[PDB]
Write a protein that binds this ligand. Structure first.
Ligand SMILES: Cn1cc2cccc(NC(=O)Cc3cocn3)c2n1
Ligand SMILES: [Zn+2]
Length: 140
């Protein structure tokens, strides 16, 4: 589990969104595994605006933050889980790292701020849904 809290937005994995998220919806995209809902309180996270390929992510199944090298956001075939049919997921970055399901939501960050959130992985893979192209998260 986990979310990004930027401005009056809450960014979560679409597959983990609550009824309150869907009732206060700003934007969602199944192909990216992302959903954004509105918040009453202002958040403290800042979004990175860059092309970094190194950063650190939080792994809840280890209680640890790990430094990683990750690929640029791409269209990747991901295997069937309980949440999606084997399909192509867009705007996804991969790194080598310990992952399990309930880790989705952990933040990946670089020197500029939050890069994305955990979404896919297994066999020492961890896939992050990028948010750096969502420039509108910084306004309104
Ligand atoms: C971090 N992590 C490890 C996983 C192992 C297996 C499945 C994962 N992801 C999901 O269930 C969510 C999903 C995205 O696209 C399709 N399904 C994993 N995430
Ligand atoms: Zn960066």
């Amino acid at each position: 589990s986990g979310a990004i809290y930027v401005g009056n937005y809450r960014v979560v994995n679409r597959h983990l969104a609550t009824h309150n998220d869907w009732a206060n919806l700003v934007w969602e995209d199944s192909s990216r595994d992302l959903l954004v809902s509105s918040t009453t309180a202002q958040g403290c996270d800042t979004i990175a605006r860059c092309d970094c390929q190194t950063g650190v992510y939080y792994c809840s199944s280890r209680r640890k933050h790990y430094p990683v090298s990750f690929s640029k956001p791409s269209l990747i075939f991901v295997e069937a889980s309980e949440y999606y049919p084997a399909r192509y997921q867009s705007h996804l970055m991969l790194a080598v790292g310990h992952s399990e399901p309930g880790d989705c939501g952990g933040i990946l960050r670089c020197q500029h701020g939050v890069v994305g959130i955990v979404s896919t992985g297994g066999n020492g893979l961890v896939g992050f849904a990028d948010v750096r192209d969502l420039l509108w998260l910084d306004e309104e």
